[PDB]
Symmetry: D2
Subunit: 117 residues, 4 copies
């Protein structure tokens, strides 16, 4: 279900593997922003969701540093996986950049991503 | 540095190790909500931040499922390590609960936690 | 342009008048939550947006109290208006409920609504 | 108890009057950002809050355009008034800037301000 290759609305690619333990591991490639090639991701998901048609809560983090460049930022996605013919992962994210103390009021962007297979 | 035992304004406890690879691993114990005992966390951080006075960007995730309890929820903290006169982690977070499609509009809480050692 | 009747993805109805002052006034009707009938809204908008084809910044508030009921809550929508053939208002919102101090950590939901005519 | 002159952690100044209907009217002056002098604000508040110790839900908007400047941006504050010894208004905010479609993913900042009398 959650494991596989997903794409959002900006065209970024989320490649993820959901493990026994509730662990998420894989790779993120952004189509936008100060980003090039793939980045490591890690996260967690609820490995025993409610049985009432509820979705599956999950979240993951990407620090946008790889061998090619470093944006000095990290993003976390919070959302849920909804399985089925039209499987989706619906999220909201927070992108925090390293700022000085004086600019910290402006260090965090908020947005929402929708991923489909 | 980031490795260590941190507490937030609620009294929750964040125990982390920062790997040289940009990995964050540890446990989280919440003082509030539908939680008891400790939860695995996993995250990422900028392992080569700027030194221009800027903080260190980081994020992590906790799914609130352990051997004791399952809240069917996942929270992500996005923020930055500030190495001022005091060690501090300022974050904003997103908590998403598993919900049916009907209730998805009301699935996600947002807040802000500050951590000191 | 902004002035008109708008509907979001949940089926809520936003009727507003954009004033010369940069004032937004109207009524809001939610299809979801603890709400019946129309509610008073007020907001503001950039009455002189960039000419580069950027959208128009705006926001508005609704306290969910009227003669029918009082949810002891208030939402604020923050976003931009984009004109043309398929004019749209894309927003993110914050919904804060009155709580005790002990429960302030869970007082605020976050979401996103997209409005069309 | 909401009416009056408030200051936040950044040094911004917030002058409000709460109307009986449940209106919020006033001016806002920002210590930071692409801002100078006063800005009209407007908003709503729960004029009939619970009487169990809960705060009063409120919200307000500021479009950062005035005689002096236009940032092509709007901020909304959502949160609650905690009355008593140290009157507080705890908020979270969304700041949206007019952008083109291409940059829309990065148009919104999120933050939180604490105001005191
Ligand atoms: O009630 C649940 O669903 C478990 C949530 C755990 C508590 C939340 S996570 C964000 C915030 N920071 C904390 O230390 N506790 C709350
Ligand atoms: O339940 C309440 O506290 C009052 C109803 C709030 C409904 C919310 S406001 C954000 C979202 N957009 C809508 O059109 N309805 C919901
Ligand atoms: O720079 C702009 O686009 C306009 C000024 C922005 C000031 C922001 S609004 C949120 C935060 N709280 C404040 O008191 N000031 C900043
Ligand atoms: O700081 C940067 O510019 C690098 C990261 C790129 C931004 C992101 S993360 C949220 C959004 N979703 C997505 O696929 N790309 C952008």
């Amino acid at each position: 279900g959650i494991t596989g290759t997903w794409y959002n609305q900006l065209g970024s690619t989320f490649i993820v593997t959901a493990g026994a333990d509730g662990a998420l591991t894989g790779t993120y490639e952004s189509a936008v922003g100060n980003a090039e090639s793939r980045y490591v991701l890690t996260g967690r998901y609820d490995s025993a969701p409610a049985t009432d048609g509820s979705g599956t809560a999950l979240g993951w983090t990407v620090a946008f540093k790889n061998n090619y460049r470093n944006a000095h930022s990290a993003t976390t996605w919070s959302g849920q996986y909804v399985g089925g013919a039209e499987a989706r992962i619906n999220t909201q994210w927070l992108l925090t950049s390293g700022t000085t103390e004086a600019n910290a009021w402006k260090s965090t962007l908020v947005g929402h991503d929708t991923f489909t297979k």
